[PDB]
């Protein structure tokens, strides 16, 4: 029993965190095999942040301009290339702590663990979700760029995120490990705004199923709804539309608890209308949307 926001054990990722310095800028890099991945903005100076020409800035750099530190050992850079917004620094040593890994690009609503690092040193681990506006509500200070988001599949690390920037609202934007930004963001200091965020409806429903599995049933009702009627109500509370895919994904939890997805959807409509009335669901007074249906099943079964 019990339900917690739970991150994956970060050990496999900790052994890949290195410090990458280029001039006066220092951020984190991910050392996998003989390659160190880091945000390409590490090559930017003061007047290269509004409109950097990364191809032009990178051509002017040599391997000896990149100082890579793995623990108290300086790694030697033997090559450099750029793939979208990620810089790849070929080093002269394969990381002996390289786990089995994959680079996976995730979709909004997907959760992952973040290993927050400063100066190539891991300081904390927390669980995040990719918001529907493609930002993450992380916890990052200056120097956290290059900190990564990941999931663990048995013994395989799926790297899904690398931190690049903080938007004016305090939310964070980054890329997958191929340098492709999540969202319409660019790695420039030009005026950028996170779109209006919405609630990840499928995740809230998955979390209501977690609550039912844990014995919290007060919010349940005798109602069901059509998918269309649910979405009309949901949109009014800034909730993401629930697709038939989401309904299918909730199938196992629906079967386990004996509460049809559209039946749980009617509970959600009611909760949105009434609020909680001083009650909590899994120790929370708000509807939690950072647990996917996969997370709920993994944590409960």
Ligand X SMILES: CNC(=O)C[C@@]1(C(=O)Nc2cncc3ccccc23)CCOc2ccc(Cl)cc21
Active site residues: 41, 145
Question: By CB under 8 A, is residue 190 in contact with a second copy?
Answer: no
Q: How many residues bind ligand X (CB under 6 A)?
A: 15
Q: 90 vs 188, which CB is nearer to ligand X?
A: 188
Question: By CB under 6 A, is residue 51 in contact with ligand X?
Answer: no
Q: Give the residue carrying structure tokens 């938007």.
A: 167
Question: Which of the listed partners (a second copy, ligand X, none) does 145 bind, with a CB threshold of 5 to 8 Å by partner kind?
Answer: ligand X
- The Cα 76–Cα 256 span in angstroms is 54
- Residues belonging to the chain: 301
Q: Which of 160, 124, 158, 152 is nearest to 140 (CA)?
A: 124
Question: By CB under 6 A, is residue 189 in contact with ligand X?
Answer: yes
Question: Which of the listed partners (a second copy, ligand X, none) does 118 bind, with a CB threshold of 5 to 8 Å by partner kind?
Answer: a second copy
Beta bridge partners of 70: 73
CB of 170: closest distance to a second copy in angstroms? 3
Question: By CB under 6 A, is residue 175 in contact with ligand X?
Answer: no
Question: By CB under 8 A, is residue 252 in contact with a second copy?
Answer: no
- Contact pick of 25, 189, 214, 224 for a second copy (by CB under 8 A): 214
List helix spans (H) across 238-282.
244-249, 251-257, 261-274
Which tokens sit at 58?
């990178």
Q: State the DSSP H helix or E strand holding residue 172, giving kind and residue range, or none if neither.
A: strand 172-175
- The Cα 85–Cα 175 span in angstroms is 7
Q: Which residues bind a second copy (CB under 8 A)?
A: 1-12, 14-15, 115-119, 121-128, 137-141, 143-144, 166, 170-172, 214-215, 280, 283-286, 298-301
């Amino acid at each position: 029993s019990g339900f917690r926001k739970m991150a994956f054990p970060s050990g496999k990722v900790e052994g890949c965190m290195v410090q990458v310095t280029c001039g006066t800028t220092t951020l984190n890099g991910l050392w996998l095999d003989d390659v160190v991945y880091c945000p390409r903005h590490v090559i930017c100076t003061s007047e290269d942040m509004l409109n950097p020409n990364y191809e032009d800035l990178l051509i002017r750099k040599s391997n000896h301009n990149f100082l890579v530190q793995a623990g108290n050992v300086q790694l030697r850079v033997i090559g450099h290339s750029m793939q979208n917004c990620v810089l790849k620094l070929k080093v002269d040593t394969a990381n002996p702590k390289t786990p089995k890994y994959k680079f996976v690009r995730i979709q909004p609503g997907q959760t992952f663990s973040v290993l927050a690092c400063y100066n190539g040193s891991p300081s904390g681990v927390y669980q995040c979700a990719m918001r529907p506006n493609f930002t993450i509500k992380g916890s990052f200070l200056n120097g956290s760029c290059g900190s990564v988001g990941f999931n663990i599949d048995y013994d395989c690390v799926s790297f899904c995120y690398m931190h690049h920037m903080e938007l004016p609202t305090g939310v964070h934007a980054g890329t997958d490990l191929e340098g492709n930004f999540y969202g319409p963001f660019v790695d420039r200091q030009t005026a950028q705004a996170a779109g209006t965020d919405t609630t990840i409806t499928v995740n809230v429903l998955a979390w209501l199923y977690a609550a039912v599995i844990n014995g919290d049933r007060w919010f349940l009702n005798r109602f069901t709804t059509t998918l269309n009627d649910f979405n009309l109500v949901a949109m009014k509370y800034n909730y993401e539309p629930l697709t038939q895919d989401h309904v299918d994904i909730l199938g196992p939890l629906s079967a386990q608890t004996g509460i049809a997805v559209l039946d749980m959807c009617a509970s959600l409509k009611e909760l949105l209308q009434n609020g909680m009335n001083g009650r909590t669901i899994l120790g929370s007074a708000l509807l939690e949307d950072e647990f996917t249906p996969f997370d709920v099943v993994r944590q409960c079964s």
